[PDB]
Amino acid sequence: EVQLVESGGGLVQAGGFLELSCELRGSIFNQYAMAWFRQAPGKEREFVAGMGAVPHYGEFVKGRFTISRDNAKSTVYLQMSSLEPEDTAIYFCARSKSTYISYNSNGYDYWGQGTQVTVSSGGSGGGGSGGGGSGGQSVLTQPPSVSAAPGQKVTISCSGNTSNIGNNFVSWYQQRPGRAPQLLIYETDKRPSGIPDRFSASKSGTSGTLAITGLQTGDEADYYCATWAASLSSARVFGTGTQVIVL
Amino acid sequence: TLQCTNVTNNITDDMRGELKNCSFNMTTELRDKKQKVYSLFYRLDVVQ
């Protein structure tokens, strides 16, 4: 009695990750290939993916999905990635009549009951248009200058946007007068060997805060807050700068 | 030749040296290439 049992399905936001499965019980796994078919509402079944000794994909997959077989438990997986909202359908599991895979629906003899996989984000996760999409043109805002008595505590605020600071780490640079810049803080929670622990940093939302204790004359310099990210060029921005003056 | 270090993922006082985190070189799909891989072994299955 050849029987096919599946898993997976359910809601996921657009661009999410889902994995489906389907095991074979009543027949030898290494004698037959497997395939995935999806039937959109009101449409006909179309080939999605299938693997015997070679993986094959549908014309609409565009390299997003990935099929594998694990002979240990005789199950075929389908690592769905970058799930666009047009992929919603009922996904079937089919056992081929041989070791080979056909793109037609009549190259298979045993079918699964079905499994609805739906995605209805409708662009809610992204949307772009300034927020996330191209980041517009965001420039960090910093106070013009700060001043405090020697040995006191000073705070520097570096507020930007969600993409540059909110969604990415922030690094701080110190530029002494007539001297090369030096790194002090990287990803807001670590310092190099050459910098003492007198400098502390933290982040909250889209604003970064730097805490300096035991300020001295030698610390008089210009501080810059910078963010880097290869995903988007807008996140690569340098701060205006804060001037530290010790009375 | 493995290169093992103790596991310290919030261990308990009973399981102190009983787990070793080892890394070793293994051949890839091509016989002309090696790569570093790691695995966890119990203390009873390894010697110095």
Place this chain on the structure above:
Amino acid sequence: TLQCTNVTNNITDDMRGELKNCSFNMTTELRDKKQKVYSLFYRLDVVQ
């Protein structure tokens, strides 16, 4: 490959060059370790 030399320890005249003292690298029980060993081989079992 074998690095071989004739064995001669007040050897009898009938055995001028019957035996060879051959040395060669060899693999140990660990793959990434080699060992230098030697063996005696009869001339009929080695070819220059």
Place this chain on the structure above:
Amino acid sequence: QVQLVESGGGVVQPGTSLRLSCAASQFRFDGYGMHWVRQAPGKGLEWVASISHDGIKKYHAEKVWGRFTISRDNSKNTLYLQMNSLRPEDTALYYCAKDLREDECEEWWSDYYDFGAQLPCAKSRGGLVGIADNWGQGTMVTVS
């Protein structure tokens, strides 16, 4: 702490071309990326370009799109920056920096029936990591 040398600057007319050379010492140049930062006198910093360890991935800023070219030579441990279509606003100070990720070797060449031999590196992963910790003295470039 390693030694950084910056040279190749000078005074050139607008619309001309120039090349700047940055030398690397006391560290593996091939194992780190390179970046160029422009800072006018009395103004803030401005990232210009970034290059990966292997020179495949290239990044440029909006203000220098289509006119600034960056290339690296790991064999000579020398950095080449070609400038085209210079403008008066380009008069500023350029800083030479390196990366921090300390790229390693993913693969090494193997001899199956030895496997104890130290053989050259075959494949590697690295690049990007747009973070600078060591800044050189820089070079002064004038456009007028």
